[PDB]
């Protein structure tokens, strides 16, 4: 299946995430208005692109 590319518009704070896991909000590059909340393992900042294998799942707190 094709993969989706989504740009990080904001690194969410005070999430309660597990250490090393960062919760972010990303806006789709294909449709530039749709947004989704995701979990990121690496060091992430704003305005970098994530490659999402699935575009439909909404992320939850990992704890």
């Amino acid at each position: 299946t094709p993969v989706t590319l989504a740009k990080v518009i904001k690194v969410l704070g005070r999430t309660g995430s597990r250490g090393g896991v960062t919760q972010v909000r990303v806006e789709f590059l294909e449709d530039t208005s749709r947004t989704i909340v995701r979990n990121v393992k690496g060091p992430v900042r704003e305005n970098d692109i994530l490659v999402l294998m699935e575009s439909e799942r909404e992320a939850r707190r990992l704890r």
Binding site: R14, T15, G16, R61
Partner: peptide
């Protein structure tokens, strides 16, 4: 326990489900 905001989402789920079912 839950963070603030997660309680808001679960309350929104429950309440909006009840409201939509009643309507």
């Amino acid at each position: 326990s839950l963070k603030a905001g997660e309680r808001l989402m679960e309350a929104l789920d429950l309440g909006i489900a009840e409201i939509e079912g009643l309507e």
